[PDB]
């Protein structure tokens, strides 16, 4: 699993992406392994076009989500300030 980080600007709406993996809602197969389901048009996100949809979600600025809930890694972009570099898993 290669691991990458992105710079997103939490625009307006916010960054652009929606996670799913978390500890309290195992996207995976049963893990808080946390990954993104979505990226919405539009936003920070898929205006920046530097993350990818089911990347498991590594940090959050200075956030670890090794095991956090999907709500917590979620909060974790929302809680990046505005430009954040959120670090992903790729295998």
Same mark, same amino acid.
């Given at each position: 699993?290669?691991?990458?980080?992105?710079?997103?600007? +939490?625009?307006?709406?916010?960054?652009?992406?929606?996670?799913?993996?978390?500890?309290?809602?195992?996207?995976?197969?049963?893990?808080?392994?946390?990954?993104?389901?979505?990226?919405?048009?539009?936003? %920070? %996100?898929?205006?920046?076009?530097?993350? +990818?949809?089911?990347?498991?979600?590594?940090? !959050?600025?200075? !956030?670890?989500?090794?095991?956090?809930?999907?709500? %917590?890694? !979620?909060? %974790?972009?929302?809680?990046?300030?505005?430009?954040?570099?959120?670090?992903?898993? @790729? @295998?």
């Amino acid at each position: 699993m290669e691991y990458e980080e992105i710079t997103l600007e +939490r625009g307006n709406s916010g960054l652009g992406f929606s996670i799913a993996g978390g500890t309290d809602n195992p996207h995976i197969g049963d893990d808080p392994s946390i990954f993104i389901t979505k990226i919405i048009p539009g936003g %920070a %996100a898929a205006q920046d076009g530097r993350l +990818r949809v089911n990347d498991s979600i590594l940090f !959050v600025n200075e !956030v670890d989500v090794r095991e956090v809930t999907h709500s %917590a890694a !979620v909060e %974790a972009l929302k809680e990046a300030g505005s430009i954040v570099r959120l670090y992903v898993m @790729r @295998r």
